[PDB]
Design a protein around this ligand. Structure first.
Ligand code: NAG
Ligand code: NAG
Ligand code: NAG
Ligand code: NAG
Ligand code: NAG
Ligand code: NAG
Lengths: 491, 491, 491
C-alpha cells in the first residue's frame, strides 16, 4: 500500500495578498482592522483626566482660578491627560479686564498642559525695592472677600506712590524664581480711567507708556484714556475703570525687563508648573465613564484590534492607530481532519487517514508569535515634549499638523509592508512543515522503502488503524511486520 | 547515460551587491536610476497649474487683482498646482500704497496657495455701525473706472465723518464670516498726507495712533506726517497723499479688535479661500507644454524610472524621488539556451540539452512582481497640509527645510536597504528553483535510478531527442524503455 | 560503522530573543550596547572645533569681537563644530549699550553657527546719500585705539548733521550686499542722554521715534529720556549717555526700511556668513584633548560600539545613537572540537571525530557581514540644515525638540526590529548549513549507502583516522575500501 503525509484541503473563505504569489485563497483569516463607535468622554483607565482646574471650587470659572481671585483658592489636583473644552474662557468675579486686547485670554489653557501646578509663596518683585519708596497695595472697592471686606486680586497689585506728578520713567528687572526644572508664569498690567480720575489719583491726564522686554519679544502699550467698550465679565456694576493685562513666561537662567510711567499695576504671586502632559480638544467629562483611549473625533473608545479605519484625529491613551485600507492575516492553510497535518494510507484496504497534533500546534504557535510581534508596533512612546497651544498663530499650528501628518503616513505604509511580509512568511512555513514531516516519515520505515519521490512511499504489507497510530505515536518497527530493520554499525 | 537538470551558464556583464555574498557577477541587470534633463514649465498631465490669478484680465497685475481694483474684476479659475514666479509683485492701477512699510507686499502669494478662491458678497463691518452716524465712502480722483468716473478701491473704503476735531479713539470688533472650512482674509489701512491738508479734511495736524489685535499678535501704527518717498507703483501723477495698509486672516470661531483715531481707512469686501494645494518656485508657463511632474530645479520632467540621482529640490506631481547612489537589480542568473532552466543528457551519444519554459517563466514573473512592489514605494501621499509661504521669517523657513531634509534622508536609506534585501532574496530563490526541479525529475524515473546525489542520475539505456522532449513534456514511463515501473499499492 | 555530520554541542552562556522561537540559549554572543563615561571637552578627531571667536585676540570678549571694537580685530579661524559656553556674553571695551533692552544680546551666538565668517570691506549705506548732506561720524572720547587716540566703533557710526532743530522724519532703504549664498548681518542704534544734553547736541528735549521694517517684522522705538540703569559693561567711567541697539539679517534678493528722526546712530560695516555647522552646549575647551564625538551630556566620548544606553542628548561627530534596552547577537551555534561543523564515526572502533574548517569559516564570514550591515545604520548624514539658536522663543524650541524626539524614537524601534530579524536569520542559516553538508557527504559514498535518513549513513567496513581525513579532504573512493564505485554513463 501507499503511505504518505501532508495537509488537509478545505473550502476557502478568505483571500489574502502577498508580494510574489498575488492573491491566495485560504480557509480562515484574522481581521486586524475595525471601525470605532462614538462614545462620551470620561476618565482614562490608567489615571485621572483634568477638565476643570478646581473641581471643588464652586462659583469660580477657569479664569478666576487662574487669576487667584478671592473665594477661588481651592486645591488643584494632578492628572495624566487634559481636555480643552473652552476656546474662549470667561471670568465673573472681579474688576473688569479688557482681555481680548492683549494676549492674556488663553491663560487657563496654558496652565492646563502641566501635571504639577503650584502657586508661589513669595512675591515676584519685592515691594520695598521700588524707586518711590512709600508704596502700598490699594484694596479695591469691588473685589470683596468671602466675608465682604474689600480685597485685592492676589496676583496683581494696584500700586500708589508718595509722589503725584509727571515722571520720566522707571525700570525694573525680573529674574527666575522657581526651581531648575520648573516653568514660571507671571502677569502684570496697567490702569485706565477717565481724564478727571487720573488727575485726582495719579496727577496726569495724558495716556502713558509701558514697555516690556522678555525672552519672547517686545511689547509697547499706550492705552487709550477715554471712551470704553461695554461693561462685562465682572461682578461689579457702574465701573468707570478698566485694566490692561499682559502675561509672561520664564525658564531657568532667564531674565526680563519692564519700563513704566505713572499708572502701573505691579506683579504679585506667580505660577510654577512642571511635568508636561498631552491635551485633547473635546467636551466636558461625564460621570462614571472609563474608556481605554480618548479620540478627538469619536470620544471614549476601546482597543479591540491594533488597527482601525475611519476618520483621522488626535488621541491620548492606549488606542489603535490610523490605517488606510482593510487588512487580513492568514489563520490556516492553503485551500483548493481535526488538525491540518496528517497521514494517509491508501490501498485495497480502502483509504484511512490520521492526524498529528504536535506538528499542527507549532504552526499555530508561530502564527500567534508573529501576530504579537506585529501588535507590538503600536507602542512607540517614552518621549513627551512640552507641546504648544491651539490658538497662537497659523504658521506654528500648520507646522505641528505637518509633523503629525508625516508621522501618520509613514507608520501606515510601514504597517502595510509588514502585513504583506508576514503573509508570505506563513505561506512558505506551511510548505517547510510539510517537507519536514517527510524526513520523519522515512526515518523508521527501513531500507525496504519504495518511496514515490513526491512524499509518498510504497511498502509490501497492509496497514490498519494500529499502523497509523503506531507511526503517529513514533513507536513503529518494520521488523514487527516482517521486513529487515537495518544493518548494525558493529561489523 | 547521465541525465540531470540545472541552469544555463552565460557571460557576466554586471555586478550587484548583497548583504552576505558581497559582489556577484550576473548576466543581466535592470537600472533603477537616471539623471533628468531640464525642460520648460507647463501644465501637469493631471490638471491645471496656476501662474496668474486672472489669465483673462488684461492690463492688471496680481496686486491689482488681489486688491479688487476696478477694471481688474475677472474670474479666478481653479487649479491643482501653483508657481510663485514673482517674489516682489507690483501694482499700477490706483492710488499709491507704501507696500514695503508693513506686511501687505506678499498678498498674491498668500492667495495663490488655495484651490478655491471666492470674493465676498457682503461687507466685513456694517457701514451704519460706526460711532459717527453720517459716514460715506469718498470716491477718489485717481482710481477711475472703465468709463472714467471716479471710484473707490472695492476692498478698502476711504472713510469720512460728520465731526471734525480731536478724538480720543474708537474701537470695533471683527468676527468670522466665511463658512466653517474657509479662511477669511481682509485688509485695512490709514491715510497720510501733509499737515495743511489733514487740518482741512480731518481737522488734525499731528500723527495719529492705530492699534490692531488679532490671533497673530499686536500691531501699532503712528504713521509719519511729512516727507514722503518717491511716487511709484501707481497710475496717478502729482499726488501728495499715501496710504498705509495691513492685512489680517481669520478662521472659524475667531475675532479681532481695531482701535483707531481720526484718519482711518476702513475694511470692505474680503476673500474666502479653501482647499490648500502645493506651490513651487519657478518661471511663467510656456504655451502647450505638458509634463509628468514639476521640479523646482529642472522644470518639466517625465518619470521613466522610479528613482533618480542628481540635485535635490522640491517637486509637485508624479515624479521620482531622491536617491544617493546608483542602484541595479538582478534580471537573470549567476554567471561564471532559449531559456535558463533546462535538462541535459550526456553519454556516448555526445551531449544533448533541452529547455523548460514553465519553470523559467515563474522566476521572471516573481522578479516582475518584486519590481512592482518596490516601485510602489514612491506613492506615499493622501495627506496635504496648509503649508507656509517663502518670505516670512528665517526660523520658520529653516524648520520647514529641516523637516524636508530629514524626510528625504530617511527615504533614501530605506530604498537602499530594500534594494539589497531584494537582490539577496532573488539570488536565493534561483537556488530554490533548481532544487525543486530535482524532485520533479526523480518522480517519473522509477526505482532503478542511481542518482549521483548532486542533481544527476544514472540510467541503463541511451537517450535521444525523444527522451529529452518526453521528460520535459512530462509523460515518460521507464516501462516503454524496459525497466520496472513501480510496485502496485495493492498486494 | 555509522558515519554522519553535524554541529558540536557546548555549554550555553547567553540568551537571545527571536520572533518565533522566543528565548534561545547560545554558547557565545556579541554585545552591541555600552555605557559611556564622561570626559573633558576637546577637539574632534576630524577637525577643529570653535569655542572662542578670536582665540588669538587678547583682552577681548566675544561681544567686543562681534561689535568690531578697536583693538579686537584679529583673524577668525575656521571650524567644523562649535560650543556655546556662554548663554549671556558680556562686553568690556567701549561705550555702554543697554543690551538687555532689545535683542542684540545673543550676537556672538548668532555668528557662532557658520563656518565662514568675513567682515565687509564696504559700508551698508553710503555716507554721502543722507537727507542732510554735511554729515560726519563723531569720534568718541571713550572708545580709544591702542595708542590712545579717540576712535569710533567700526560697525556703528555716531551721526551728526548740519541742521539743529525739529525734523518730521527721514526714510532709508537697505538692500542685499553679500554674495548669492551669503547671510548678511547688520546693526544700528539710537542715542539716549539727559534732556539738557540733547538740546546742546541735537536741539530737542523730547524722546524721538524710530521705526524698522525688515523681512522679520516691525520694531518701533521711543527710548526714555531721563533716569538710567546703573553704569556697567564698559571701559569708561562717569558717562551720562546710553546707546540702544538692534540687529537685522538679510538673504539674497531682500530689502528693508528704516525711518528715523533726530538722534539716530547709523549702520556701518556688516558681516557676511556662510556654511552652517552644528553647535553643542557645554564648557570651554581643554588643551590637548581629542575625542571621537562630542555629547552634550557626557563630554568627549569614543565609539567602541555602534549603540549606547543611558541619558539622551545632542551630539556631533562620529558617535553611537540612543537605544532603549541592551541587545545581544548570536556569535556561535545553538546550545544543548576545533570548529563546530564536523563529522563523526561510531562503531566497534570506539568513536572518532573530525572538524571541517572551510564550512565553519563561511558562517563566521556571514555573521560578520551581517554585523557590518547593521553597523552601517548609524551613518545617515549628508544633509545639514541652517538650524536655529537656543534662546529665541518657547514655541520654536519646543518644535525643534519634538522633531528630534520623533526621530530618535523611530530610529530606536527600527534598530530593535532589525536585531530580532538578524538573530532569527542566523539561527535558521545554521540549520541550512548542517543540511547542506549532507548532500556533499552522500556524493562520494557510492550506491551501496544505507542512509539513516537523519543525516547518518551505514557502510560495510571500518573507518579510521585515515577514513576521516579522506572524507574531509574529499578524495575518497569506495573501491579502495572494497565497494562498487558506480555505474558508468557509457554503455
Ligand atoms: C474586517 O474589518 C473591516 C473593518 O471593520 C471590515 O470592513 C471587513 O468587512 C472585515 N472583514 C472580515 C473578514 O472580518
Ligand atoms: C484563528 O486564530 C486563533 C488565534 O491563534 C486560533 O485560536 C484559531 O484556532 C484560529 N482558527 C482556526 C480555525 O484554527
Ligand atoms: C544606470 O543609471 C545611472 C544613472 O546616472 C548611470 O550613471 C549608470 O551608468 C547606469 N548603469 C547602467 C548599467 O545602465
Ligand atoms: C529583464 O527584465 C525585463 C522586465 O522584467 C524582462 O522582460 C526581460 O526578459 C529581462 N531580461 C532578460 C534577458 O530576460
Ligand atoms: C552588555 O552591555 C550592557 C551595557 O552596559 C551591559 O549592561 C550588559 O551587562 C552587557 N552584557 C554582556 C553579556 O556583555
Ligand atoms: C565572535 O565574533 C568574532 C567576530 O564577529 C569572531 O572573530 C569570534 O571568533 C567569535 N567568537 C567565537 C567564540 O567564535
Amino acid at each position: 500500500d501507499k503511505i504518505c503525509a501532508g495537509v488537509a484541503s478545505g473550502k476557502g473563505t478568505h483571500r489574502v495578498e502577498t508580494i510574489t504569489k498575488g492573491e491566495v485563497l485560504v480557509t480562515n483569516a484574522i481581521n486586524m482592522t475595525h471601525t470605532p463607535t462614538s462614545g462620551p468622554f470620561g476618565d482614562l483607565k490608567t489615571g485621572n483626566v483634568r477638565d476643570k482646574l478646581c473641581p471643588t471650587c464652586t462659583g469660580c470659572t477657569d479664569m478666576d482660578v487662574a487669576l487667584m481671585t478671592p473665594t477661588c483658592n481651592g486645591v488643584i489636583p494632578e492628572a495624566i491627560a487634559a481636555i480643552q473644552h473652552e476656546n474662549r474662557p470667561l471670568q465673573s468675579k472681579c474688576n473688569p479686564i479688557l482681555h481680548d486686547l492683549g494676549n492674556t485670554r488663553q491663560l487657563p489653557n496654558l496652565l492646563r498642559k502641566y501635571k504639577k501646578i503650584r502657586k508661589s509663596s513669595g512675591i515676584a518683585f519685592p515691594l520695598a525695592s521700588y524707586a518711590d519708596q512709600p508704596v502700598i497695595s490699594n484694596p479695591s472697592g469691588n473685589c470683596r472677600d468671602g466675608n465682604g471686606v474689600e480685597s485685592e486680586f492676589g496676583s496683581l497689585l494696584w500700586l500708589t506712590g508718595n509722589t503725584k506728578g509727571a515722571i520720566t520713567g522707571e525700570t525694573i528687572t525680573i529674574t527666575h524664581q522657581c526651581n531648575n526644572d520648573e516653568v514660571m508664569v507671571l502677569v502684570w498690567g496697567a490702569w485706565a480711567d477717565l481724564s478727571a480720575t487720573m488727575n485726582t489719583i495719579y496727577g496726569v491726564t495724558t495716556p502713558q507708556t509701558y514697555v516690556s522686554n522678555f525672552p519672547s519679544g517686545r511689547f509697547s502699550m499706550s492705552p487709550f484714556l477715554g471712551n470704553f467698550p461695554a461693561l462685562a465679565e465682572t461682578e461689579a456694576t457702574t465701573a468707570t475703570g478698566r485694566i490692561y493685562l499682559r502675561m509672561e513666561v520664564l525658564e531657568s537662567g532667564q531674565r526680563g525687563t519692564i519700563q513704566y510711567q505713572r499708572g502701573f499695576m505691579g506683579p504679585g504671586k506667580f505660577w510654577c508648573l512642571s511635568e508636561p502632559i498631552p491635551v485633547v480638544k473635546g467636551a466636558v467629562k461625564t460621570n462614571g465613564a472609563v474608556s481605554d483611549c480618548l479620540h478627538e473625533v469619536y470620544g471614549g473608545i476601546s482597543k479591540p484590534t491594533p488597527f482601525y479605519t475611519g476618520n483621522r484625529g488626535k488621541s491620548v491613551g492606549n488606542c489603535p492607530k490610523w490605517v488606510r485600507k482593510p487588512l487580513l492575516v492568514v489563520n490556516g492553510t492553503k485551500a483548493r481532519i481535526a488538525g491540518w497535518h496528517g497521514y494517509s494510507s491508501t490501498g485495497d484496504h480502502g483509504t484511512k487517514v490520521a492526524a498529528d497534533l504536535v506538528s499542527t500546534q507549532k504552526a499555530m504557535d508561530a502564527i500567534t508569535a508573529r501576530i504579537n510581534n506585529m501588535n507590538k508596533m503600536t507602542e512607540r512612546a517614552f518621549s513627551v515634549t512640552d507641546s504648544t497651544m491651539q490658538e497662537i498663530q497659523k504658521e506654528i499650528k500648520d507646522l505641528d499638523k505637518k509633523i503629525d501628518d508625516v508621522r501618520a503616513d509613514e507608520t501606515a505604509a510601514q504597517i502595510e509592508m509588514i502585513v504583506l511580509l508576514e503573509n508570505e512568511n506563513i505561506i512558505n512555513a506551511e510548505d517547510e512543515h510539510v517537507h519536514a514531516l517527510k524526513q520523519k516519515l522515512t526515518k523508521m520505515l527501513g531500507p525496504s522503502a519504495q518511496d514515490m519521490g513526491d512524499g509518498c512511499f510504497i511498502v509490501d504489507h497492509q496497514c490498519k488503524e494500529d499502523c497509523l497510530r503506531e507511526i503517529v505515536s513514533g513507536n513503529y518497527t518494520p521488523s514487527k511486520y516482517g521486513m529487515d530493520e537495518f544493518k548494525s554499525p558493529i561489523i
